[PDB]
Design a protein around this ligand. Structure first.
Ligand SMILES: CCCCCCCCCCCCO[C@@H]1O[C@H](CO)[C@@H](O[C@H]2O[C@H](CO)[C@@H](O)[C@H](O)[C@H]2O)[C@H](O)[C@H]1O
Ligand SMILES: [Br-]
Ligand SMILES: [Br-]
Ligand SMILES: [Br-]
Ligand SMILES: [Ca+2]
Ligand SMILES: [Ca+2]
Length: 323
């Protein structure tokens, strides 16, 4: 029990550095960049839990961030508190952005339409459901269709907290669509990152406190069946997938004590993994970037675009590096 706490929170871990050539802090990101997603054309959305969605054009040489204006009357901005995000590009090239929201005491998924010329997000729909009690991240598979991780079974934060420390592992994953919402996987100890292979045939789920990434075959009827489970010596948080290769790019918290019981004199470090050939017998895992937090603290996500690496954090900055 003190033993399972030590292993779940990886309380002994320290970080061997892995450096990258030319890394710059992104000016204007100082209060979190928890999740991000990069479109094929190099525009990157970043959420920051005011809650905001930020935009970077990664085709520029030193991209600057701008704050996207949210418009519409279906959303209260004043309680907007974004967590994970996901995009869906329709047949006509309409870009939808799905954003997990934690407005006060509950959980929603907000659906926006991205209006490129205006640099704006038009709110379309607030989704909520009983099978979405505690949403951490989603992967979109249509404008209003996604898989969602619930990082807890309970809604009440006092109960979440007991639920986590008791080690219940009741977190679960929900398939959500206008006609049909169901649990597709369950029994996780803090499910969180989630993503999908470019051909739509596999779904990847990060189980934070177990230090695992689960690979599920995804079927024509939207059901998932377990295929493989990879384990790591780090708390895996968000998963990004490179659409050209299918590689996973994963933001990780080496030592979970530092990220869950925050201490400015012992702040969390950062770590990015690349996973290739995830279906093969020895998937290739590489630490691409790793540090103890003297530059970037609490890395949650990383993705790559034409030789650059962008890395976001729970409550700190963001880092842009050459690979
Ligand atoms: C699903 O299974 C569910 O999860 C956990 C373990 O995975 C089980 O057991 C759990 O509860 C007990 C209750 O005192 C904890 O102290 C224990 O550390 C934990 O492993 C639950 O009895 C069961 O409800
Ligand atoms: Br509850
Ligand atoms: Br750390
Ligand atoms: Br370091
Ligand atoms: Ca996401
Ligand atoms: Ca997270």
């Amino acid at each position: 029990q003190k033993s399972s706490f030590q292993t779940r929170f990886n309380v002994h871990r320290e970080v061997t550095p892995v450096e990258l050539p030319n890394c710059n802090l992104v000016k204007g990101i100082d209060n979190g960049s928890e999740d991000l997603e990069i479109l094929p054309n190099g525009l990157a959305f970043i959420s920051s839990g005011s809650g905001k969605i930020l935009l970077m054009d990664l085709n520029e040489k030193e991209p600057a961030v701008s704050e996207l204006e949210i418009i519409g009357n279906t959303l209260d901005i004043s309680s907007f508190n974004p967590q994970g995000i996901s995009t869906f590009i329709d047949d006509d090239n309409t870009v939808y952005l799905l954003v997990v929201n934690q407005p006060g005491s509950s959980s929603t998924v907000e659906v926006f339409k991205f209006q490129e010329e205006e640099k704006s997000l038009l709110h379309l729909k607030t989704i909520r459901h009983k099978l979405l009690p505690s949403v951490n991240d989603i992967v979109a598979v249509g404008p209003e269709h996604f898989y969602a991780t619930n990082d807890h079974y309970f809604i009440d934060p006092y109960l979440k907290s007991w639920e986590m420390h008791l080690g219940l592992a009741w977190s679960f994953v929900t398939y959500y669509s206008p006609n049909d919402v169901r649990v597709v996987a369950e029994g996780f100890d803090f499910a969180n990152g989630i993503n999908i292979s470019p051909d739509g045939k596999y779904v990847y789920i990060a189980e934070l406190l177990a230090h695992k990434i689960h690979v599920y075959e995804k079927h024509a009827n939207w059901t998932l069946t377990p295929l493989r489970v990879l384990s790591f010596d780090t708390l895996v948080d968000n998963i990004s997938v490179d659409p050209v290769t299918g590689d996973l790019w994963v933001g990780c918290h080496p030592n979970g004590m530092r990220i869950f019981f925050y201490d400015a004199e012992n702040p969390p470090g950062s770590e990015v993994l690349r996973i290739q050939d995830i279906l093969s017998e020895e998937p290739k895992v590489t630490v691409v970037y790793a540090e103890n937090g003297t530059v970037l603290q609490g890395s949650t996500v990383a993705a790559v675009y034409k030789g650059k690496l962008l890395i976001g954090t729970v409550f700190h900055k963001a880092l842009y590096c050459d690979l």
